[PDB]
Amino acid sequence: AVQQNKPTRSKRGMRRSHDALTAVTSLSVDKTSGEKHLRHHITADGYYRGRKVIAK
Amino acid sequence: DERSQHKNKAKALSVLGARIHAAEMAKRQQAEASTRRNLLGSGDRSDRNRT
Amino acid sequence: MRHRKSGRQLNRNSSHRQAMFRNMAGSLVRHEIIKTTLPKAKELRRVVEPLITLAKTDSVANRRLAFARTRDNEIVAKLFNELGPRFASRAGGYTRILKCGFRAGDNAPMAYIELVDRS
Amino acid sequence: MIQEQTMLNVADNSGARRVMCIKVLGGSHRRYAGVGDIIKITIKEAIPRGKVKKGDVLKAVVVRTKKGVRRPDGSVIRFDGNACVLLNNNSEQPIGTRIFGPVTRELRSEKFMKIISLAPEVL
RNA sequence: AGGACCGAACCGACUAAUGUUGAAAAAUUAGCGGAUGACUUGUGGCUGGGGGUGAAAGGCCAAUCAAACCGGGAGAUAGCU
RNA sequence: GCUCGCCGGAAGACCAAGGGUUCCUGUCCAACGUUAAUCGGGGCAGGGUGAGUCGACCCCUAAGGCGAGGCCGAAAGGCG
RNA sequence: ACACAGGUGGUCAGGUAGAGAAUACCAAGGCGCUUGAGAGAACUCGGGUGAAGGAACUAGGCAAAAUGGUGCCGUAACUUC
RNA sequence: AAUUCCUUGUCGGGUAAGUUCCGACCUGCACGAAUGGCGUAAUGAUGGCCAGGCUGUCUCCACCCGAGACUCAGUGAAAU
RNA sequence: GCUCAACGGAUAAAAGGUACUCCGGGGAUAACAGGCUGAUACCGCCCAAGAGUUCAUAUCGACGGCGGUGUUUGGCACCUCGAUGUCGGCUCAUCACAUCCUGGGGCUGAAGUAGGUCCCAAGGGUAUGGCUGUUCGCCAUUUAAAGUGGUACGCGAGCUGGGUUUAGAACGUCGUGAGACAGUUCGGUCCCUAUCUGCCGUGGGCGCUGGAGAACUGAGGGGGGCUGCUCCUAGUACGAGAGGACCGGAGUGGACGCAUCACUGGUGUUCGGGUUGUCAUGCCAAUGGCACUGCCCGGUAGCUAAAUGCGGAAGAGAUAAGUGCUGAAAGCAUCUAAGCACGAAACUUGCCCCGAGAUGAGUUCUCCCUGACCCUUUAAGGGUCCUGAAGGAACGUUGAAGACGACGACGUUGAUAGGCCGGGUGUGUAAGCGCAGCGAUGCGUUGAGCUAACCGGUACUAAUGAACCGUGAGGCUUAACCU
């Protein structure tokens, strides 16, 4: 239930070695407005795949 | 009875020996009684072997 | 295991799910575009598209059935007078999901769901 | 599907009315008994002047189970109650001279020819 | 009429489960006993430590009871660690 | 703002006891809220409690306290 | 010690069903309990259902399951009637 | 026997099988007459045994509904 | 002048209980368990008077003797008293053979069936209940068998808490008493979110010498290995009869394991209906919310056992105890010393699964890359421009795959998921209208309406044009060919 010897900072780093986040590989460029956005998601202006899907 | 196995065993052996001796003694008494009962008459005048 | 099963539980009991989907379907056909989380949006289709399909043919029985599944007479009236003739030729797929990022408060993947011919 | 502590009705006129299964014979660690397999039973209720008394220990063969039996075509015959026929403890032949209720085809063998002969209907 | 019966408020805590770094330094859920009486409760008062009080368990006397707590003798003593 | 659900002999409303501005308005998110916070019982500033009849104060006593003189007790003090 | 599933005396007492202040759903009124979103593994908690058997479980029918209201017929040993 | 060590004393009932129970027997280690003896209707969240109904308690576990467990975002302990 | 007798005399003067307890210490010292030893316990062996009608050794074996195990009760106090939780039960096991069953064999006081004893053999299997807290034991009924033991008399950071073992209370007994009992009887809190080793699964990184996609080989490892009954041989061999085979063949079961939902069923709060109380949609009618899915009746797919398919083998190699052939040492005899044959569920294969991280990193098939230059410390060196392939990853729709990663299908040249159309299934004659009845309600339209996860289709919705990672012919030394 509890430890008998204090784990090292080395062991702590070894355990945390897989806890790293993964950056997005590449963003997509909208074909009309030219801005970047996450793949399969609408752009920050409200466009998606050229057409303006949501007003503002 | 006792905490010691050796004493318990000794007591058990003594009781067992007494029980066997009692059983043999009782069997002898029962046989002796039966034989005596058959040989002796009822005590009435009818049961006779000599007059 | 849940082999060949369908339907997201969404960490709610069945009555809550039924009521929530009824409310969400009413809201969607009222406003023509609504924003909700991606699994709830994907599950909302299976309730709002049969209602429109039912609404395609105007009849007293169909209206009572739509009323039983929505409990909002204004919603039923709109469905049968507008959404039925508008989608009278479509072979299903009267909605469209557009993934719209992540919610600020709880990082839930949000989406907009709208009728295909909204404009 | 008869196991220990199961009460059964009696299908013959041997004098017993309600018996209880206390062992399923024919194999180590055996769980259930279908039709046509011996079980060791005790008599828990009898008629006033019959061939057997209450409390006797003897064998019996099961003729009807509520779970039923299955035939090669996939069918199943289910009965409304579990019933057995009392047998002699050594010869394993029926004590009574009449059978009550129907039985099934699973019994037709040289061992229980008497039972299927006396049965009023063999399903 | 009744320290009568069934059964809520109210008082209590018999059984099980959970919880045992708990929501809680003893409670919650489902059952349970009394429920016009030797009942229960609010406000105020009285009984002080070798003393009180006890339908009596050495129980309770401010989460502490085979002698409360606070200050003092006091840095008691300790052939023990 | 429109739906959904929960309590409803209470999870609604008004007091005493206890707390002492936590009440209302404007404004701010550093610290407090087991998350975000523009919101708050959080910070800052201003406002808000109106009585011959409600309650306390006042007149009167119960249990009980204090107790002129008094009795008793080494003193302190106890009882009245 | 907490924005704590605990404790706190008095007053008011609506509709329908119900004997009822029990219980269910509502009115007047007030809340959704200050982390959410997914997924639907073992395992844990609180529940629902179950073929054939019905206590074979176990220290023990522990716990679950079952009975449950009103009117009427009928009701044994024993008894301090 | 709330009491008997030897003891599961012996017999009978209940069970297929009963170190417990019930009814007797008396060889009462070591009951006994207000530190009361033996019964006793009613009463008991009292101790033991048996029977009917009922059942996942079990043979022997299976599926389903929610709250955790698992993943993501935010805050972020402890015993050792 | 002191039986100051505890006699170098603590005082002239002194007994008990603590389970209501409490403090300072000790494993300096006991109970549990471990350690050494083996009196005791269990299992063997040496001599052979005797039991066995005669005959020690078929089976036993007196008087005596020598060991093995650690195995009961002990002996010692070496470990722990700044805590090593303890009897029995549940769940889960693993090892030894002094083998309980199955397998092989010698002798028999072995006619046969069935036995006794010993040797070899641990591959598999090795009950359910009544009674008590029970281990043990007795009893009922099976079984081929209901083994003996080790593992802290295995297992409470997995479960229990009945007994024992705290505080309450009583009975018998002892004591004047407080209290005490290997005397009993009623009641009596079992905590821990796993850091490391271990184990079951499942990934990330790098390596395997250019990179990549597949399919394998098998060094090695795991799983599995049980057995009854009936029939034929054959009522034959054997036997006076009763009874009744070896060897060999066939069928059908019990337990266990793997797989599956086609059949029989369970679940199926996502499908349909019946119905009670209340509230809402203005109201009737019809619905919806709440009352455990309100209570039920059914039930699709999926998951499941009780449901139904399959498996344990046959065969080969070398053997154990054992049986032998030929044969001397030792003219004979002799299974052995040379040589040769047979022999079991044990060993190695044969059956199933994992498996090149097998760093000893293996094998085979296929695909992709064939540009120019600078610098100094001149070498498996560093840098710039152009170039980005095969393939992978990321994102999306997802799955009878799944905790999350992973694995599998699909991404417009598309049926991957949702919807839609048709069908199937489940529920059981919807709503509206008309007719009969004063009315509840019945009949017709109507086997209607509704129908999830199923089946066959259909681009209607969502699966983007891209972009990212991965490079640009792959070191040295020998050997055999090629020119």
Side-chain angles (χ1 to χ4, degrees):
Chain A
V2 77
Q3 82 207 357
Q4 289 206 10
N5 288 107
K6 174 191 193 178
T8 62
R9 53 182 75 82
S10 173
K11 266 286 161 172
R12 185 187 57 206
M14 282 180 170
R15 171 177 65 243
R16 297 186 182 168
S17 65
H18 305 284
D19 284 352
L21 306 187
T22 75
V24 64
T25 73
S26 75
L27 300 181
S28 301
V29 182
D30 173 89
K31 77 183 189 176
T32 296
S33 88
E35 68 203 319
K36 282 162 302 181
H37 71 104
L38 267 184
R39 183 89 168 159
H40 297 121
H41 297 216
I42 75 183
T43 63
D45 282 357
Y47 288 82
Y48 176 61
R49 302 188 59 183
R51 72 173 276 254
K52 168 93 169 303
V53 296
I54 57 154
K56 257 169 191 189
Chain B
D1 297 282
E2 285 315 295
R3 307 190 174 185
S4 175
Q5 167 167 349
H6 312 300
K7 299 170 164 291
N8 291 323
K9 190 175 167 160
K11 202 190 278 192
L13 285 174
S14 67
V15 173
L16 189 43
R19 280 192 195 169
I20 289 156
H21 186 70
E24 287 293 323
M25 269 292 110
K27 197 256 183 182
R28 277 168 197 125
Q29 292 330 102
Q30 285 301 101
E32 194 204 355
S34 78
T35 50
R36 185 179 293 113
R37 209 172 285 113
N38 294 327
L39 284 170
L40 286 170
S42 69
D44 203 28
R45 295 154 284 266
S46 66
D47 214 340
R48 264 169 283 142
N49 272 336
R50 275 172 196 180
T51 301
Chain C
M1 67 215 81
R2 45 150 298 287
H3 293 177
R4 318 286 277 183
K5 295 192 189 174
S6 62
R8 295 163 209 268
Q9 175 183 331
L10 309 172
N11 304 296
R12 300 167 152 80
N13 51 56
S14 182
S15 65
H16 183 185
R17 259 196 314 283
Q18 176 164 8
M20 174 185 65
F21 282 145
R22 189 173 302 174
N23 285 342
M24 201 183 296
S27 295
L28 170 61
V29 302
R30 174 193 317 276
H31 298 113
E32 313 210 7
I33 177 181
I34 58 159
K35 174 176 183 171
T36 178
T37 66
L38 180 58
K40 282 177 211 160
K42 284 183 163 176
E43 205 58 40
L44 172 61
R45 296 177 306 180
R46 311 181 65 238
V47 167
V48 66
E49 301 201 2
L51 279 166
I52 297 167
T53 293
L54 170 68
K56 277 190 189 186
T57 78
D58 192 66
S59 89
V60 166
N62 289 168
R63 272 182 193 257
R64 289 184 175 188
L65 190 67
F67 184 59
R69 311 226 181 107
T70 47
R71 301 306 304 195
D72 204 357
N73 264 313
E74 163 182 334
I75 290 301
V76 178
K78 160 143 197 193
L79 278 170
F80 275 91
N81 300 341
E82 292 184 355
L83 300 183
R86 190 193 293 181
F87 294 114
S89 309
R90 280 302 184 79
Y94 323 104
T95 44
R96 151 190 303 125
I97 304 289
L98 304 150
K99 298 176 280 304
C100 78
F102 296 91
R103 190 139 68 177
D106 50 4
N107 201 62
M110 306 297 295
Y112 281 109
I113 172 175
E114 59 180 17
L115 299 174
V116 175
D117 47 13
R118 173 172 59 102
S119 300
Chain D
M1 196 173 176
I2 308 302
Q3 64 194 65
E4 314 209 0
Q5 315 292 311
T6 308
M7 282 288 200
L8 292 74
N9 304 322
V10 176
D12 60 359
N13 64 334
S14 51
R17 278 302 164 82
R18 189 61 63 88
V19 310
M20 192 182 89
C21 174
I22 63 167
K23 190 62 61 179
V24 182
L25 308 182
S28 191
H29 279 285
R30 179 152 183 174
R31 282 97 170 79
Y32 321 111
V35 301
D37 62 355
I38 309 300
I39 49 179
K40 172 75 60 146
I41 56 156
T42 177
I43 299 176
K44 294 283 180 176
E45 167 183 351
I47 66 180
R49 282 81 67 190
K51 300 159 197 167
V52 292
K53 290 294 116 184
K54 161 196 179 177
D56 307 324
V57 165
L58 71 159
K59 302 188 162 67
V61 58
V62 176
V63 301
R64 296 191 289 272
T65 77
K66 203 163 171 197
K67 185 78 195 297
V69 298
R70 263 161 71 75
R71 286 292 160 78
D73 79 318
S75 66
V76 62
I77 310 181
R78 291 193 304 258
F79 302 94
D80 270 22
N82 321 308
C84 57
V85 159
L86 298 193
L87 308 181
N88 175 230
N89 217 321
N90 289 319
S91 86
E92 285 171 336
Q93 297 307 100
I95 284 175
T97 45
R98 185 150 172 248
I99 305 304
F100 307 138
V103 303
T104 53
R105 309 284 175 195
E106 278 72 10
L107 280 187
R108 58 184 307 113
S109 66
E110 80 270 12
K111 184 76 173 310
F112 305 121
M113 274 315 301
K114 189 90 201 158
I115 298 196
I116 63 169
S117 72
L118 292 181
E121 179 182 13
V122 193
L123 258 71

